[PDB]
Design an enzyme around this catalytic site. Structure first.
Site, mmCIF file in Angstrom:
data_model
loop_
_atom_site.group_PDB
_atom_site.id
_atom_site.type_symbol
_atom_site.label_atom_id
_atom_site.label_comp_id
_atom_site.label_asym_id
_atom_site.label_seq_id
_atom_site.Cartn_x
_atom_site.Cartn_y
_atom_site.Cartn_z
ATOM 1 N N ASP A 170 9.468 99.326 43.911
ATOM 2 C CA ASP A 170 8.442 98.281 43.892
ATOM 3 C C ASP A 170 7.245 98.471 44.835
ATOM 4 O OD1 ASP A 170 11.104 97.431 43.076
ATOM 5 O OD2 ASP A 170 10.285 95.411 42.822
ATOM 6 N N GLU B 48 5.559 96.170 39.961
ATOM 7 C CA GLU B 48 5.655 94.714 39.844
ATOM 8 C C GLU B 48 5.026 93.887 40.979
ATOM 9 O OE1 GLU B 48 8.433 91.803 39.821
ATOM 10 O OE2 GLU B 48 9.709 92.481 41.487
ATOM 11 N N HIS C 194 7.749 89.708 38.146
ATOM 12 C CA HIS C 194 6.363 89.227 38.185
ATOM 13 C C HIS C 194 5.415 90.008 37.293
ATOM 14 C CE1 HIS C 194 8.454 88.714 42.020
ATOM 15 N NE2 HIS C 194 7.805 87.572 42.160
ATOM 16 N N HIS D 199 15.959 95.667 37.013
ATOM 17 C CA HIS D 199 15.337 94.767 37.967
ATOM 18 C C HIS D 199 16.209 93.513 38.096
ATOM 19 C CE1 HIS D 199 11.810 92.584 39.756
ATOM 20 N NE2 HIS D 199 11.536 93.806 40.171
#
EC number: 3.1.4.16
Lengths: 255, 255
Positions: free
Chosen positions: B8, B37, B66, B148
């Site tokens: 990430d 993300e 997100h 995720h």
């Protein structure tokens, strides 16, 4: 000075490695703290569990989430003889046992406290403010904190919140050791999760078939502790004058 | 055969280390998968972020939780030019973008899939069965799954669920890398969490004060992306015949 923290002992496999391995490296340490919250079949700790641990060289036994899942914890805490520490932020005044114990390592004082996180977990007392309160004592010495929690966010904050005033903050509960082992400015060893001591090939400690079937079918399935090869995860620490001067992970997988 | 997965990317600190550092290691790999993300100030991915990452050497951009927080993601997915892969288990047939993309690496096909967990998260389609369905195709070649999720139980399970029929299952979203990097029987590399690429001193990527005060006062506080040294986490892998023959963590912390 030299203390080893061992993660969540999970059922027999966890108890097995713990009792066979710990003695092989015990001399290389002055004190050993072990989390036994899943000792009894994955839930709570029973009398044999605690005995086996201490007999193996464990100096302090911390709990957490499942501190009260086995009926033996009450008499053990009542007959106050075993070196057991349960979550401190259990607000009820009548809560059995204690949230912290201080030991005499080598003429020096070592305080081991046990804390419970709240994010994604049941609600108990505010862990952050509970710690501010325990830290206002005088007799503490080198302080070790076992933060039992799920959320990495909550664990990282406890590390920063305690950096400089505690020797270490090692997380437990999630069962997978993290590679962020570090010493925060101030001399505070920190690691989001020590990893646990239990079945190497499993699902958070459970037999693989059960949970996989729950996840797939979305219907309940019976599941037990996984069988076979077990692993032991922990953190080797070195303290000096109430601070950590060295912190590194320790991991052993039985053949 | 040689591919790198980077965790990430979080805000400017994350984009800084990504763009400065990736190009020096890029030569060691045939393909590089990057989870973006958290690119856009910790929430989502904007056009610059994506442009910078690709220029840096990334061949695939995976998202997650997100994936939709920045408006730029809709036009970017609509023009279908940037190699983007959003969570596959979003059951709505009209959801923009795609849940996977297969790329031509070195005479072989590499399929990258992005998946969302559900424990301690928002409910979406069942990831386990969503994968069973994808895996019925015959033109996927070497498959890589970026799961995720939050729960270690759901991550370990997906690893056992795909062992032997996917080359790798690397989790993300928790920001702290795990030390359980392993190759599950059947040739499937696995790691509960790659770790993230963002600010080294923070609370999950945010500046320390905001979240800390939230935790202590239980009252909302305005918090933003942390500043200072950035860390970069990933997993270097070696695929061969649709299987992983080598997996080791990659970590870099800028001074």
């Amino acid at each position: 000075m030299r203390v080893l923290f061992i993660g969540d002992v999970f059922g027999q496999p966890g108890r097995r490695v713990l009792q066979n391995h710990l003695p092989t490296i015990r001399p290389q340490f002055d004190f050993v703290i072990v989390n036994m919250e899943n000792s009894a079949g994955g839930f709570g700790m029973h009398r044999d569990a605690a005995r086996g641990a201490l007999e193996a060289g464990a100096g302090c036994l911390t709990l957490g989430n499942h501190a009260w899942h086995h009926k033996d914890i009450y008499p053990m805490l009542s007959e106050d003889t075993y070196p057991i520490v349960r979550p401190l932020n259990y607000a009820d005044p009548g809560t059995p046992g204690v949230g912290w114990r201080t030991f005499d390592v080598n003429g020096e004082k070592l305080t081991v406290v046990n804390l419970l996180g709240r994010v994604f977990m049941e609600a108990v007392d505010n862990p952050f403010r509970t710690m501010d309160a325990l830290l206002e004592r005088d007799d503490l010495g080198t302080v070790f904190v076992d933060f039992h929690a799920e959320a990495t966010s909550e664990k990282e904050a406890m590390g920063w919140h305690l950096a400089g005033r505690v020797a270490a903050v090692i997380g437990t509960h999630t069962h997978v050791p993290t590679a962020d082992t570090r010493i925060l400015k101030g001399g505070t060893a920190y690691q989001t999760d020590a990893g646990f001591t239990g079945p190497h090939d499993s699902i958070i400690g459970s037999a693989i078939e059960g949970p996989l079937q729950r996840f797939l079918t979305e219907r309940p399935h019976r599941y037990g502790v996984a069988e076979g090869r077990a692993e032991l995860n922990g953190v080797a620490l070195h303290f000096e004058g109430g601070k950590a001067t060295a912190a590194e992970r320790y991991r052993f997988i039985e053949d």
